[model samples]
Target chain A: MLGLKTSIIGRRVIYFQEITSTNEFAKTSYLEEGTVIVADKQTMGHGRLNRKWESPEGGLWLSIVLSPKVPQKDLPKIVFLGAVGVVETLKEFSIDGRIKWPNDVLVNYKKIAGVLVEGKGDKIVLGIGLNVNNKVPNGATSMKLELGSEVPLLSVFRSLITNLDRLYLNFLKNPMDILNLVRDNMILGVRVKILGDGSFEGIAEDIDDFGRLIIRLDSGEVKKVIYGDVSLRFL
Target chain B: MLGLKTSIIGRRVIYFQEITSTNEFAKTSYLEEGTVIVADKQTMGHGRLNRKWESPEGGLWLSIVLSPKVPQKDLPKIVFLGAVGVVETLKEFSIDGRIKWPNDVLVNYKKIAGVLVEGKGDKIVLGIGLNVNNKVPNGATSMKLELGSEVPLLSVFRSLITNLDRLYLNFLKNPMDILNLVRDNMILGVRVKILGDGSFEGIAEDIDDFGRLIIRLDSGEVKKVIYGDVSLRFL
Candidate 1:
């Protein structure tokens, strides 16, 4: 994008040996579209609820900047775009990744990867954290743990952008396609409970066009939930 | 260096998406010996005496961290090591740069590059800033303005480490060798003025083994000035 450079998404790269957080840095830094912020480790990495995300030495911590020229309301779909990117990216490493609703990617119900999208004015900063060789605490999994061997951090990073670029460019034209990928790969079609302001239980129906979770409440009424953390329950 | 991984120095690298200052960041962050910190641009870059260094889009801003296993008194020689690195690096690009003593590299007596050294406990952070394609005002100039053509930022950065790594390894063994290179290349042996705790005019005799500017005053008194700014006076 910058010149005759081959890469579309990672046309520019800013790497760090260590930083507070790639997600935190992107909030204030001047990152041009397609510029990727990569770090070896993060001291203050966090997830959706601002809870600590364990980022040790050998993890792929990246924050991708982009100017997705879509309506402000449809901006939430960007999370789906990132989740879909992860699904396709993991396919290369022979690791099956499932989307946990809005932000996280799971392997055998353990968190393996996550997408954090923050909109800044005209551009959006997308942070992708994948545990590769780093040892994570319980309830999380890594490629090294899954494969029982080590994978290079840079190799996983390279595959991420290679797949993300295609999905990103496609999302620019057909945004719905990304939403469909998210629906296909995400955890749904199960009894779910919403953990937010209203607090309710429902059967997960689908992910809507605007990236809202469409659910059928126990009262037989359908609800297009705008925002919340969703957890599944057994029938 | 990573491809063949041939260089002793720069075997590992951490790049910045954007940072306050490579020097500032290296002060508290973790860095292994021979690991380099590179940035596309810096927002709060500073030189000696904490003066601002203008870092725009097309400049080479780096902080090379090292743990020189020498006495703390001898660590100042590391500054000359960087100046020598700069003097030689310019040779490959056909840019004749002169050392303006202690910290700066000049082209046609205008500032082109500078090295700021800060010791943090055991390791030292050496910050190098060079104007390549970046635009500067009155006192500073860039490689783009000098050659009337633009050069790639990465190309210049690559040359710097390739040259610095060799010089750095040599310094770790024979530290005095680095001081000799500084004396041979710096602006000295001229009537000069030193402005500091004691401001005086003298015939600058030499850069001492301890990296001090040794001068012979008008009264023929020899002084080994440890700290000050030196400016040449026209005979």
Candidate 2:
């Protein structure tokens, strides 16, 4: 609408040279339903279960704010939707991307990006980080390495927003509308060992209706994992 | 341990005449697991789901800080435990109390108290406001009016923390230990109606293993509600 590419996901964008955390900033603002806060670099990004997510320059450290009218129990499903967004965006560049439960985007068994969902007010702030157009940091991989060269960061951000908005709209309409798409993009049905003091082993099944991961445990009991660090048995 | 003639909850008491949100302050410091933060008045008290909880003088506006090692998914369960704490504390003074799912404590069908859960770092900050020792302000109720005389605010706070710490410790050892106690203390279970885009009548079955409310909906389906407001049908 204003010469800048419009996204149904983030109708308004707040770009910053650097921020401590886009999620924290978005939580404090009275943004529109599709407003997005993006930082060129996040000095203090965080991941699931309170882990520090590395966010240097040349990465997409952004958080989108949305006021969803669904029940709060259904929020975990947004994590799956976020993963699908990352995977679909990677596919556009002809790169093989895989989704790790709750929120990790990987290429060739290396973590390339992560998503963090923080619920505040009537809106849910979704923070997404994708490593693109840069060399891999220590213990990380990048789209450039996987795809053979640096991709245009701005174009990648645009494509990601477009796809994310589409999926988010579908989610608002019906969570199941994007289920299969998420499942297809997810690193197919792997046996994973859940780490942490609260741990177990299970086959990662499809997500439950509420977006909880249906992990088929070795004891044949199906447990819905709402949060945890999941490591694939054989990546 | 101090000879304050008050209960163990706020035995080691700290009070502020004026403050922002007690919860916000407690979240930044490292307090012993059952430390209670209280203010004669909270200038900016918040509620669950983005509601502004106004705190006038003479109200028991407080926040309890806890350091439990529960997984993030299990965090919602702590809210239920806190509700039980409020219910038990009210019962000590011969006041009938009920818990509405997610938040809100009802005194004789009118809202008198509420709980707000905010997570920071590894600690869970629970901001609680009870209409104790305060006159009804702007359509709010006080337990004293419903029960006949003014109850000691400090005594009620002390009992609340003691019972809260006891129940919380039991829950830390075993997740299901507090369910029966909560169910027995629940007065809203029989006549509560779920609030949403449309009002739906339901009876509270039991809190699920994951701490979601298993309600028998009017349509005869068992719906597990993890979040939303509820109130006694008549109250």
Candidate 3:
């Protein structure tokens, strides 16, 4: 039994045994904010930029519908908040997780989870795929592998929903706090390649007040990246 | 007969005798780019900020679907381009139409047309509602009243589609040129009140390269407004 303690984030939970993608399902429905959609399995899960997301039966594939009253320029902060919520949830499991820029959650230098935020109008669907009690790929890690035992999926869902509810409320009250939380948990002070309109190399600086990733480019220019895929560069 | 002279825009026109809203219908469909949806009547037409749009018979209520590979920050230009297309169409009727900040087309200091742009993923639905041969409410005018005769709806559609096709191509090539064209025809150097997060009175200076309205506040601080309702301020 899934015991959700959140008041708003998961007020209405829609569960499915199998779905193509939770995000896709959320988009097709006229659901309200704070609605949570969960699936035991996903056949066609996807992440940012249409990357395939592996959602096994034991993994967590869910999407939350939110109608935040924020400007389009500031929407990235919600994704960052999602990453923070994921990190906080992983913390409860005694597994340390750090966020890569944008939305990837990494543990022990391997990807453990990812977030995908999509929206139209004021409605936003935040999809999260976490490798829980499952065998992950070579470049990925699972909670069961880290803990040396299969963790309860319901416990992970409860913790994640609770953290997300608190963070989402904080986001509405003071968005800066959520941004700061993400900044504190993000991997900084590293050389990375950002793929956007074009690719560029830069040193990951601090996130600015507007929630933009400030990067010190090799050209000695401090660039603020609003949206892009960032990967650490190796010498 | 509608003699449209466009290669892409409006190439596949879907005409309806009555609909709820062209934009709403377009958003629900998985149509390809360059598809045009036109309706003779809308039972529940709406505009920006969810304001009621009177889409009676004889009015031009249409929506276009486009898939442009442009950044989200530059999306407002598409709405501006729609305004320009409407203005060019008005020019064929020997009526001068000027654009208000964002997406309203004005004639004789009254609104004659409006545009609403909505997007999900790479798909964008651009809805344009124009008062062509219908009786408009107060603070609005139609081409029929201005020209003292009923203008051919087919002719208006052809001109608008042609202009939109040309401007859309130009936007893909050089976006700055289109911005400059909108700036040349916008109501600049006028005192206006922008209703956004809060209300602010300022003089409309010019539209920035990102298609934002630059307003010089009473305190002389120039602010770039991204999303807001702008109206002329009375002394």
Among all candidates shown, the one with the greatest lDDT: 3
TM-score for each prediction?
Answer: 0.58, 0.47, 0.49
Interface RMSD of each: 7.1, 22.4, 21.4
Error of 2 at A68 (Å): 0.7
Tens-place lDDT digits, model 3, residues A1-235? 1223566787656555566898998988887688887877789999866878888778888899998886556677888878999999999999999988778899987999988988766689999989998778888998998899978886788789899999888778776788778888989998877655667888888888877788898889988877655544422
lDDT of 1 by residue, A5-104 (tens): 2245876665665678888877777666887877777899987778798888778888988888866776778877778788787878899998877778
Indicate the residue-level lDDT of B207 in model 3. Answer: 81
Q: For model 1, state the Cα shift of residue B24 in Å.
A: 0.5
Q: Give model 2's TM-score versus the native structure.
A: 0.47
* Residue pairs in clash, model 3: none
Name the runs in model 1 displaced over 4 angstroms: A1-235, B1-8, B228-235
- Poorest stretch of ten by lDDT in candidate 3 chain A: A226-235
| Local lDDT at B24 for model 2 | 77
- Between prediction 1 and prediction 2, the one with superior DockQ is 1
Candidate 3 lDDT for residue A42: 82
Which of the CAPRI classes, incorrect, acceptable, medium or high, describes model 2? Answer: incorrect
